[PDB]
Amino acid sequence: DNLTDRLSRTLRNISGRGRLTEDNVKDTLREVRMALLEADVALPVVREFINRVKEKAVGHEVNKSLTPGQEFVKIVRNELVAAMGEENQTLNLAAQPPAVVLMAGLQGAGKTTSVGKLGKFLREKHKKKVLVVSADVYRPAAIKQLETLAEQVGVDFFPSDVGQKPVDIVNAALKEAKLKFYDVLLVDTAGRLHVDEAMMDEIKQVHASINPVETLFVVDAMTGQDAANTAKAFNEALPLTGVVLTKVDGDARGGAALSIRHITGKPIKFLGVGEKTEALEPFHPDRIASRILG
């Protein structure tokens, strides 16, 4: 990423210094603010991050250590993690089976792909008997896409077709999920390229009839700051439990990851890091912060 190089260079010079002047701390923070802003991180997030470092990096606290540069570096890390999220947020599949995970996103965010990815993760790493279904009757080849995905990853597919109504489709799928003791039902959805009441009304009807335990917004990382604004929109119309940030491999900037948790107020739970089925990665903020700073 270009954020990783910029921050790592700015921090590296400070680490060696055995004492940091207040001007030295202020100058380094201005360079950090520019790097995050250049990475499409939202100003509300950058502003709060810089203020939190400044308060904790007062020279008295930083200069007390024998490695003041090191102490400053590791404040920046701690506050980056705080912005990206709280520890690891997982899906609650511990409630009454079947566990319904309803997935939303605008078209091309990668929700259908992510449906597959998640089903492989739940069966392989959690030994969950999984069933998936598609309420995207607007594109026919889409339903097939899920079907093909479901066999590559080894979950079960509940069939649907163009003529039928999304509410009827998920009601059938839950009924069936109960009858064969499935652990989770993942429910794919249609996307409209914009968060419009047309899209929200359909999701909220599905959502209402099927009481999902997790509502996951799939958002595309290479839309940068829009990802947070798009998810803040869906969240305002129908509350989210988690976000899946897809196409992280190609962004090369970041910012959606730093921005989503604080703009939306809900966590990034998963992270799409490849076109392949294996490329789903639970979101651990500590690991991401470490990579950004080296």
Ligand SMILES: Nc1nc2c(ncn2[C@@H]2O[C@H](COP(=O)(O)OP(=O)(O)O)[C@@H](OP(=O)(O)OP(=O)(O)O)[C@H]2O)c(=O)[nH]1
């Ligand atoms: N690099 C990368 N790509 C991802 C990731 N997740 C999804 N994609 C890509 O997103 C594209 C759209 O996926 P869909 O699953 O159809 O998205 P949708 O359900 O929201 O409509 C796919 O591209 P496609 O159909 O192969 O081509 P195109 O649609 O991009 O033209 C897929 O390969 C990811 O984590 N990393």
Ligand SMILES: [Mg+2]
């Ligand atoms: Mg689709």
